[PDB]
Amino acid sequence: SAFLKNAWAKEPVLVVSFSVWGLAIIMPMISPYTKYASMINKATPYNYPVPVRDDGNMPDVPSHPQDPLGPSLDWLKNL
Amino acid sequence: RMMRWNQERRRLLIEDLEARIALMPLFQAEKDRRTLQILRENLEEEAIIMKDVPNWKVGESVFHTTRWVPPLIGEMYGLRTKEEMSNANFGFTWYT
Amino acid sequence: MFFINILTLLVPILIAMAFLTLVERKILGYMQLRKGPNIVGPYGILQPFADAMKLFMKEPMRPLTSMSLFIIAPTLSLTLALSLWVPLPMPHPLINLNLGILFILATSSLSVYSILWSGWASNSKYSLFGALRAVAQTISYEVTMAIILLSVLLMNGSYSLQTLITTQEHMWLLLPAWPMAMMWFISTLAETNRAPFDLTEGESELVGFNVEYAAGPFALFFMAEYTNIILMNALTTIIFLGPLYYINLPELYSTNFMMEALLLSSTFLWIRASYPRFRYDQLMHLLWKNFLPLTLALCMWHISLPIFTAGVPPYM
Amino acid sequence: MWFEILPGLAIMGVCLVIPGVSTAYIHKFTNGGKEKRVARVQYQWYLMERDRRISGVNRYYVSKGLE
Amino acid sequence: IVELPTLEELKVEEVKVSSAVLKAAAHHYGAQCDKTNKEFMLCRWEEKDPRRCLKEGKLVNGCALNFFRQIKSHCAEPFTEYWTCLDYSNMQLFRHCRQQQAKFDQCVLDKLGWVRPDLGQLSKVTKVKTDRPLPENPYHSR
Amino acid sequence: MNLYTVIFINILLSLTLILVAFWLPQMRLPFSMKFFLVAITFLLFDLEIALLLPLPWAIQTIKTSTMMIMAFILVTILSLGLAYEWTQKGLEW
């Protein structure tokens, strides 16, 4: 601890340096948003969504995509 | 602020990607329609270029299989104007 | 047209490049209680043109030396520096490159050779010793210079300098990422061999590649350095200090780009007069010990800030 | 006093705004009053090219609902 | 040979409107005309052969054409203002123009009855059933 | 092409100046491993940068967890390389 103190006052870059190294190694683990990144980026539609044949008995949005069925990004909205 | 701004920016990005998602069907048809035209047009000239050549099947898949295979850029514009070919070939690397 | 747009974006910069030396020989002057050059022309405006003509007329002595690694070196220095203004995104850029910042980083990196080539070409001891040290800190500083940009990009989403105008529509990237601005500013001071970090032209130390260079060759690097002095400052004024952009009127972007670039260009002039020059090892001690650990760690913080703050930047 | 460093700067500034205003009006002249399309990704080049074919040879000319 | 289809077989009315026009109406077209669009698209991939889904493609252009004829007839002016402002921008970004977008969107809701699809709800995969039997041995494997 | 046009003007402007310079005025063993060592370190860092350069595209990768897990490991292992550079007289000129 004592060195820590002087280290905070002498060579006070490394201290800050390491501190950040860690804080970046922790925040991701504990955060209410970390999960969104893999979703928000997952959702972003880049490649055309090819439609499947309607053999039947499916929950897939038929016709207008506006159908209430399917995935939603209201989580992205009001995020 | 950066967190909120990029989240907004992301919303705009999903909006316009989806805008093409909707419009690509119109383009896909257009592309194919035009693509075939280029192949066929080349067929006409093809049926007029090596006619004299002996043992000359007007055209034949370089392959054996008979399934549609997307045409290479050269095939589409090879016989056509040099510029046309160049445009396609070096027309993106060179910005608008 | 495009040709006209090449004159503009070049000449204008060259004329401005000339007026920087003048605003350097006067701002350093008033800081040191002296008028500076005002007698040639009105208020010294003709002063930059005057020594340019004196420099080109004086004999370009070719030492009893290579004759190519000697003439390639200033040509390369001016060519890369003026070239790096090609993709700069004032309002909208001349040649918009999707991987623009990699172009700027790569083009800067190539200038280290000119120093290496000039030092080998001179064939005198002062030149070689100066070049080896000069090349060392330039590439040493390049390593933190590059990592500092990678942190930026990850919060911009792309390598294209044009994207930052849309990233900085609400706040400068100084507020966030200020800790790196400082570290970008100090690295911009090293890479332009300006004062705090200028042991290359160190006179008391190695009087050094420019030692054997006189007249026209002296001028070309010379011109190069000063154009760079501006370019790097301008990159600070796009990447970290984002000038207000209004799509309806594009020039207030360039007007503020003008104001911020001049002030930060004024700052390295002010830094020069204010500080003694660092020691060769004291310079590398800073980058490898003081800055690189700060930069690498803050680099990780900039891969984490996006993810857990669900702020991953929009590509494109 | 310090009044005098301004002359020189004025000629620097004026020579650093020209470029930004110039490049941004030699674009809006050559492209028909519409900002030069930035084709970062092919889709955009496609759309741009499609535009060329749609009218004249130049993409800036833009046909509308009345076509 | 190559069995390349004939021109008369591939000649059909063309949309031909500036890409900008489309991007502005993109959202609505993704709305009023995906039933047929999708179908053409579904044939496009199962078939693995452009040569085998052109009849559907002609339907695509057509559906869109009237989509345009409706808008031309109603709320043409709004749309005209929205596209012109959208076109000026270099990347034709949607957010620079929101005031023009609102009047164009509100009107066609008022007259055509259509609706701008909320953020998303166009990316989601669709189910369209098509008579064209499921391709057999796509890839023509021996 | 547009870039080619600009660049050749750029070289032309510089070659013009050097020539004017020459045409108008008509009227051995400096070695320190430290220097070599730096150059080396420099590339080890430069090659590392090259590995980090794709991170802007990789941010958008669906995985995310693996991305960061990978990137953090790379930065940490190189920094340890630096750390040992410190222990060694390396970095001590």
Curated annotation (Swiss-Prot), chain B:
Its main location: mitochondrion. Keywords: Acetylation, Apoptosis, Electron transport, Membrane, Mitochondrion, Mitochondrion inner membrane, Nucleus, Respiratory chain, Transmembrane, Transmembrane helix, Transport. One of its GO terms (biological process) is extrinsic apoptotic signaling pathway. One of its GO terms (cellular component) is mitochondrion. It is found in: Mitochondrion inner membrane; Nucleus. The keyword Transmembrane helix applies. One of its GO terms (molecular function) is ATP binding. It is a single-pass membrane protein. The keyword Transport applies. Signal peptide: none annotated. Belongs to the complex I NDUFA13 subunit family. Accessory subunit of the mitochondrial membrane respiratory chain NADH dehydrogenase (Complex I), that is believed not to be involved in catalysis. Complex I functions in the transfer of electrons from NADH to the respiratory chain. The immediate electron acceptor for the enzyme is believed to be ubiquinone. Involved in the interferon/all-trans-retinoic acid (IFN/RA) induced cell death. This apoptotic activity is inhibited by interaction with viral IRF1. Prevents the transactivation of STAT3 target genes. Complex I is composed of 45 different subunits. Interacts with CARD15, but not with CARD4. Interacts with STAT3, but not with STAT1, STAT2 and STAT5A. Interacts with OLFM4. This is NADH dehydrogenase [ubiquinone] 1 alpha subcomplex subunit 13. The chain holds residues 49 to 144 of 144 of the full protein.
From Swiss-Prot, chain C:
The chain crosses the membrane at residues 2-22, 69-89, 99-119, 135-155, 170-190, 229-249, 251-271, 291-311. It holds the Pfam family NADHdh. It comes from the Eukaryota. It is a multi-pass membrane protein. InterPro entries: NADH_UbQ_OxRdtase_su1/FPO (IPR001694), NADH_UbQ_OxRdtase_su1_CS (IPR018086). One of its GO terms (biological process) is response to xenobiotic stimulus. Its EC number is 7.1.1.2. GO terms for cellular component: dendrite; mitochondrial inner membrane; mitochondrion; neuronal cell body; respiratory chain complex I. The keyword Ion transport does not apply. One of its GO terms (molecular function) is NADH dehydrogenase (ubiquinone) activity. Keywords: Electron transport, Membrane, Mitochondrion, Mitochondrion inner membrane, NAD, Respiratory chain, Translocase, Transmembrane, Transmembrane helix, Transport, Ubiquinone. It is an enzyme of class 7 (translocase). Core subunit of respiratory chain NADH dehydrogenase (Complex I) which is composed of 45 different subunits. Core subunit of the mitochondrial membrane respiratory chain NADH dehydrogenase (Complex I) which catalyzes electron transfer from NADH through the respiratory chain, using ubiquinone as an electron acceptor. Essential for the catalytic activity and assembly of complex I. Belongs to the complex I subunit 1 family. This is NADH-ubiquinone oxidoreductase chain 1. It comes from Mus musculus (Mouse). The lineage of its organism: Eukaryota, Metazoa, Chordata, Craniata, Vertebrata.
UniProtKB/Swiss-Prot annotation, chain D:
Belongs to the complex I NDUFA1 subunit family. It is a single-pass membrane protein. Its main location: mitochondrion. InterPro entries: NADH_Ub_cplx-1_asu_su-1 (IPR017384). The chain crosses the membrane at residues 1-21. It comes from the Eukaryota. One of its GO terms (biological process) is aerobic respiration. GO terms for cellular component: mitochondrial inner membrane; mitochondrion; respiratory chain complex I. Keywords: Electron transport, Membrane, Mitochondrion, Mitochondrion inner membrane, Respiratory chain, Transmembrane, Transmembrane helix, Transport. Complex I is composed of 45 different subunits. This is NADH dehydrogenase [ubiquinone] 1 alpha subcomplex subunit 1. It holds the Pfam family MWFE. It is found in: Mitochondrion inner membrane. It comes from Mus musculus. The keyword Transmembrane helix applies. Accessory subunit of the mitochondrial membrane respiratory chain NADH dehydrogenase (Complex I), that is believed not to be involved in catalysis. Complex I functions in the transfer of electrons from NADH to the respiratory chain. The immediate electron acceptor for the enzyme is believed to be ubiquinone.
Swiss-Prot record, chain F:
GO terms for biological process: aerobic respiration; cellular response to glucocorticoid stimulus; mitochondrial electron transport, NADH to ubiquinone; proton motive force-driven mitochondrial ATP synthesis; response to light intensity; response to oxidative stress. One of its GO terms (cellular component) is respiratory chain complex I. Its main location: mitochondrion. It is found in: Mitochondrion inner membrane. The chain crosses the membrane at residues 3-23, 35-55, 66-86. The keyword Electron transport applies. Pfam families: Oxidored_q4. Its EC number is 7.1.1.2. GO terms for molecular function: NADH dehydrogenase (ubiquinone) activity. It catalyses: a ubiquinone + NADH + 5 H(+)(in) = a ubiquinol + NAD(+) + 4 H(+)(out). Core subunit of respiratory chain NADH dehydrogenase (Complex I) which is composed of 45 different subunits. Interacts with TMEM186. Interacts with TMEM242. Belongs to the complex I subunit 3 family. This is NADH-ubiquinone oxidoreductase chain 3. It comes from Mus musculus.
